[PDB]
Design a protein around this nucleic acid. Structure first.
Ligand code: GNP
Ligand code: MG
Ligand code: MG
Ligand code: MG
Ligand code: MG
Ligand code: MG
Ligand code: ZN
Lengths: 338, 38, 209, 102, 122, 176
RNA sequence: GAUGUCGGCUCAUCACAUCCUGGGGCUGAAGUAGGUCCCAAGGGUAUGGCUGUUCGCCAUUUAAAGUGGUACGCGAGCUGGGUUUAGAACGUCGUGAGACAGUUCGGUCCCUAUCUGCCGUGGGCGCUGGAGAACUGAGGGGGGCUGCUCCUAGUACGAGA
RNA sequence: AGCCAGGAUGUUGGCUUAGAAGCAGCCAUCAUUUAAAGAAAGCGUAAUAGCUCACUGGUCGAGUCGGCCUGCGCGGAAGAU
């Protein structure tokens, strides 16, 4: 369901098989020889990238994934079977990090790409493998090489096409309800949402886009002491970054000051988000019953001076929801670079 | 439910009952404490 | 309800209006006459004894002649009993026709299958023939092993080997009836029935769904 | 139904914005049908949507389709409406499979 | 019938000429493939410029059988040569763009309309 | 045992007949009869019913107190009656009663029909509300369990049928 | 005082510490699909390349290609590839004859069933006068496998997939 | 042991804290009228709420609670004709 990154996984490669110290005795042959089958190769844990997945909810409990013990070498030159490979379903774009001198082993690129994370243990050679002129009755046995005990950290970035950035007083969460059916928590208090949530806007069967709402940020969010600026990491992948500004906020009462305060820490996260074409729309229009609604819209739009196309919408019900979505999708078409 | 030779009251809300000649533990709060084979 | 007893005359196909060919078996049924009706008081179970066809007077001996004369029925090829279904009733001497099969639409046919004589293990139990080459000596259609070593030390009952095959009662269930003829006394049943041409067959309404 | 399903299918496809509608009156060249309709699909999802739309309306019309093929892959999907086969396929599939031969 | 290790011809212009039915699909202990069936083939002879190469393993659909096809009226459809249409491994769709030769009506019953539509015969 | 130390009192208009080890509490709300264990004795007395065991029985007072409990519910059911409350939560969940049969629609592919005992009646004040009226607590409890067993609630969304006073576990589950 | 061994073929049977199908509990069980545990032996439980191979690796299916016992089942049922008497050769050891739980080439698999057992089929007698039929059933045996598609329903669930 | 009630007063205790009002973090943990109330153990709310707990009152009315020694039992306990 929801989008949660920063998953951790523990994976162990299958231990290699164990040979057996056995000797062959037949009907007429008391001295047959060292006849002990070698062990089986240990299981191998694999990585698989699927287009369908876009979240790591299945790995927030960090289960321990076990590759089965390699089959022990049986007597009478019976080689044990190798353990079956373990494949973990992973989305596209995840980062692979080890705990302790960890590095990026590989980045998921396309569907079906396979990455090796831990190679299984080698099989244990039986007494058949150590007979020679020096020693003719080998009693020595080799333990299979142990599997790889590795700690894995999975980092995933947001795959949404539209990202939202606005104050907690702005109707970011309630706008998802007007454009989709996702049912996030909506209430009259600051910082209602704690983690980013997804939403898909499907007005037609042929064409659709994914829009995600991001938890609100405050004046002091730039340096920290709140939720920080870490939730803007799930950006730079969205084609367009919709911006919501609360007209005549109930508890803000400073529309001019807080309108430009978003850009303050936007210009200070890491590189000012490369100044991607973020739009600018207002919300809570139904609160202003009449001509006063858009009369203040131009007054607050001239303060920014951007002067580009602005949309007057109300996230409560309709009133620009059905037409703003088309323009958002229109922007998507001509720009296919993610 | 877990089935094991040793059965004990894991939490304060575990009742030990003898059903059909075997020892069982019933947890009214939540069903993770169900045991058998006492 | 009860069924009928008749004789198979052969097999023939039936062409439908859409061109589909239905291979059917043609069974002639003579008007069966009830020779006895059983009751709980006397025998403890309800059944009716019927006969079909005709038998030569010289071949018919006195014991069964009195049996036929008691019911007022002439000689018959054989005698059979059909179990009643808790509410249906028949009287002694009543002739049984064939039109009652106009609604069952599913019949069960029992008869003595063809006799194949002493059949081998391969033919009877559908065993696997051993290799005919690669050094094989005097063992092609032999059964092979028939048990384990001395620990069992015997051959279990019901073990599959050669013996008399066929010439026994065989039941084929859920056979569709195609057409029934009253004035000609023919019954057309879809599929193949056990036995050879001219053998006696017992047809009953299907017991399964 | 005859000479009426020809216009019925075209109306249903055009109801969902089909492009380059062509009707081939294969009266005797083919031994399975009487006429054929080939239509283009803008995208993979559009092709599936067109196929579902024509099948669903056919059931309400009173004719059950005999089957469809291009379900998993939307490159080319066919619908068997009895005497009429209707092909809806992507932009690429109409050139690799050149359907002007019949 | 059609069983494993059987030389097979091609009824399409994918690029192959002679393939090997070497595994028949449908269930456990599958012995034979009828006229409409999914089989696994390996390329034994193909044009170098064709869409497929030598040694490739993929799925095929039978089209014509030596033994024949039993119609519901006791009529058989015999043929001189065994042919198949090549399909992609993941998705059962024809690879070739044309069908060369007659095709039985039985493929219509099993919802194989790609072969039936672009086949200039039965 | 010690629960049986408190004899029960029957209200006015309640007739009690003893014919050995069978007890009848027939009255305003129907007629019912129960056979005993042949080991506990009830003595006819003033307007109060007492219980006692037989000498020479190992169980003794342990099982005698059981009759004191069941007979207590008998007088309640014949004068006040027994009420069982079941409610339906979830979309597509409807309940209706036609005579002696409750009609159920619980997201299945076929309607569910239940046949009630002779002395059990059910009413549907709301499409998602069924109330069971009976004279014996054991019978209505079995009936309520039968209704509950079809769609026992799951702890993720709570969909299913439940008692009015029953509290069910709620889980915030998120994975796969 | 003796062919008798491993593997393969034919034929199987039994146990459940259950591979699938069946019934459930818990879950870090949204659903499909999985993790673990309990009951359950009715049925079913793969084809090829390599090697003699059992076992394995590989290719491709299936719901699965279960674990073991039965003189590591079964050679008075078959095979004789492995090993291997007598021949010969290579490497090594020894002066040598020769040897080597080192390798390579070739190298006789007998039996007409007495008894128990089993598969079928008969004669004698009995069942209390004899005979001809037709049945109830004390008991015994056979069979019990399952894939895919559609409707329910793109419904419950799920932001969507 | 059940049942019916009470279970606050400065006081949202101070700091960090968007939110720490007892139950995300630390600290002191003293002290008020009471038969009793701990800035306090668990559920829940981001936090308020909303449920308990420690403890007290009333009806009910006679044994109740938890340690030892000993006899006989229960599970632990699945294999092949
Ligand atoms: N009438 C009206 N009220 C609105 C509208 N948009 C928001 N509101 C009101 O203002 C409140 C703002 O809260 P909310 O929308 O949940 O904020 P948010 O998007 O969740 N931001 P954050 O996650 O940071 O708390 C809403 O709960 C609602 O009461 C609107 O268009 N019309
Ligand atoms: Mg929000
Ligand atoms: Mg429609
Ligand atoms: Mg589909
Ligand atoms: Mg869909
Ligand atoms: Mg489907
Ligand atoms: Zn517990």
């Amino acid at each position: 369901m929801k989008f949660v990154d920063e998953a951790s996984i523990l994976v162990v490669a299958g231990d290699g098989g164990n040979g057996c110290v056995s000797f062959r005795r037949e009907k007429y042959i008391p001295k047959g020889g060292p006849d002990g089958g070698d062990g089986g190769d240990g299981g191998d844990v694999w990585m698989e990238a699927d287009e369908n997945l876009n979240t790591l909810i299945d790995y927030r409990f960090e289960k321990s994934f076990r590759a089965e013990r390699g089959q022990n070498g049986a007597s009478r030159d019976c080689t044990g079977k190798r353990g079956k490979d373990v494949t973990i379903k992973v989305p596209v774009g995840t980062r692979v990090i080890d705990q302790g001198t960890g590095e990026t082993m590989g980045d998921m690129t396309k569907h079906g790409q396979r990455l090796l994370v831990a190679k299984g243990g080698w099989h244990g050679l039986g007494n058949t493998r150590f007979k020679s002129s020096v020693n003719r009755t080998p009693r020595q046995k080799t333990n299979g090489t142990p599997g790889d005990k590795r700690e894995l950290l999975l980092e995933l970035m947001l795959l949404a096409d539209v990202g939202m950035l606005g104050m907690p007083n702005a109707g970011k969460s309630t706008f998802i309800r007007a454009v989709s059916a996702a049912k996030p928590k909506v209430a009259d208090y600051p910082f209602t949402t704690l983690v980013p949530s997804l939403g898909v806007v499907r007005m037609d069967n042929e064409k659709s886009f994914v829009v995600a709402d991001i938890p609100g940020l405050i004046e002091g969010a730039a340096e920290g002491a709140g939720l920080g600026i870490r939730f803007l990491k799930h950006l730079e992948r969205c084609r367009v970054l919709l911006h919501l500004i609360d007209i005549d906020p109930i508890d803000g009462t400073d529309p001019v000051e807080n309108a430009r305060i978003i850009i303050s820490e936007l210009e200070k996260y890491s590189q000012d988000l490369a100044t991607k074409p973020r739009w600018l729309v207002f919300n809570k229009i139904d609160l202003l019953d009449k001509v006063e609604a858009e009369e203040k819209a131009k007054a607050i739009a001239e303060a920014l001076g951007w002067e580009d196309k602005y949309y007057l919408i109300s996230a409560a019900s309709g009133l620009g929801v059905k037409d703003l979505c088309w323009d958002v999708m229109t922007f998507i078409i001509e720009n296919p670079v993610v | 439910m877990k089935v094991r030779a040793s059965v004990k009251k894991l939490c304060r809300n575990c009742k030990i009952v003898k059903r059909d000649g075997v020892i069982r533990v019933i947890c009214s709060a939540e069903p993770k404490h169900k045991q058998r084979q006492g | 309800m009860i069924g009928l007893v008749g004789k198979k005359v052969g097999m023939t196909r039936i062409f439908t209006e859409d061109g589909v060919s239905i291979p059917v078996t043609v069974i002639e049924v003579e008007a069966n006459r009830v020779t006895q009706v059983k009751d709980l008081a006397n025998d403890g179970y309800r059944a009716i004894q019927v006969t079909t066809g005709a038998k030569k007077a010289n071949r018919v001996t006195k014991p069964e002649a009195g049996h036929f004369a008691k019911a007022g029925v002439e000689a018959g090829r054989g005698l059979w009993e059909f179990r009643l279904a808790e509410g249906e009733e028949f009287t002694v001497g009543q002739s049984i026709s064939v039109e009652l099969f106009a609604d069952v639409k599913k019949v069960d046919v029992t008869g003595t299958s063809k006799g194949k004589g002493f059949a081998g293990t391969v033919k009877r139990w559908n065993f696997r023939t051993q290799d005919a080459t690669h050094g094989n000596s005097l063992s092609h259609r032999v059964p092979g092993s028939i048990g384990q070593n001395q620990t069992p030390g015997k051959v279990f009952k019901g073990k599959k080997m050669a013996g008399q095959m066929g010439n026994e009662r065989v039941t084929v269930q859920s056979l569709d009836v195609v057409r029934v003829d009253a004035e000609r006394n023919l019954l057309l049943v879809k599929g193949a029935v056990p036995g050879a041409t001219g053998s006696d067959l017992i047809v009953k309404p299907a017991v399964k769904a | 139904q005859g000479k009426a399903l020809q216009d019925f299918v075209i109306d249903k496809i055009d109801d969902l914005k089909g492009q380059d509608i062509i009707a081939l009156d294969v009266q005797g060249k083919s031994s399975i049908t009487d006429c054929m309709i080939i239509c283009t699909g803008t995208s993979s999802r559009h092709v599936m949507s067109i196929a579902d739309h024509v099948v669903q309306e056919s059931r309400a019309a009173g004719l059950l389709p005999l089957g469809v093929e291009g379900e998993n892959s939307a490159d080319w999907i066919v619908v068997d409406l009895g005497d009429v086969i209707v092909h809806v396929m992507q932009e690429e599939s109409r050139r690799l499979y050149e359907l002007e031969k019949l | 019938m059609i069983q494993e290790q059987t030389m097979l011809n091609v009824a399409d212009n994918s690029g192959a000429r002679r393939v090997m039915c070497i595994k028949v699909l449908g269930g456990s202990h599958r012995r034979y493939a009828g006229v409409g069936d999914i089989i696994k083939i390996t390329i034994k002879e193909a044009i170098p410029r064709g869409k497929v190469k030598k040694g490739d393993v993929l799925k095929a659909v039978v089209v014509r059988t030596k033994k024949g096809v039993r119609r519901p009226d006791g009529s058989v459809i015999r043929f001189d040569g065994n042919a198949c249409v090549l399909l992609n491994n993941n998705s059962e769709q024809p690879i070739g763009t044309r069908i060369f030769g007659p095709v039985t009506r039985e493929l219509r019953s099993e919802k194989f309309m790609k072969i039936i539509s672009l086949a200039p015969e039965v | 045992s010690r629960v049986a130390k408190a004899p029960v009192v029957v209200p006015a208009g309640v007739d009690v007949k003893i014919n050995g080890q069978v007890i009848t509490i027939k009255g305003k709300n129907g007629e019912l009869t129960r056979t005993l264990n042949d080991a506990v004795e009830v003595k006819h007395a003033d307007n109060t019913l007492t219980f006692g065991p037989r000498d020479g029985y190992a169980d003794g007072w342990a099982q005698a107190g059981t009759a004191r409990a069941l007979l207590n519910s008998m007088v309640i059911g014949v004068t006040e009656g027994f009420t069982k409350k079941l409610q339906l939560v979830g979309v597509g969940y409807r309940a209706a009663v036609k005579g002696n049969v409750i009609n159920l629609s619980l997201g299945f592919s076929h309607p569910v029909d239940h046949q009630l005992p002779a002395g059990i009646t059910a009413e549907c004040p709301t499409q998602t509300e069924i109330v069971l009226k009976g004279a014996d607590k054991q019978v209505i409890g079995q009936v309520a369990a039968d209704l509950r067993a079809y769609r026992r609630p799951e702890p993720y969304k709570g969909k299913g049928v439940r008692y009015a006073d029953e509290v069910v576990r709620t889980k915030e589950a998120k994975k796969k």
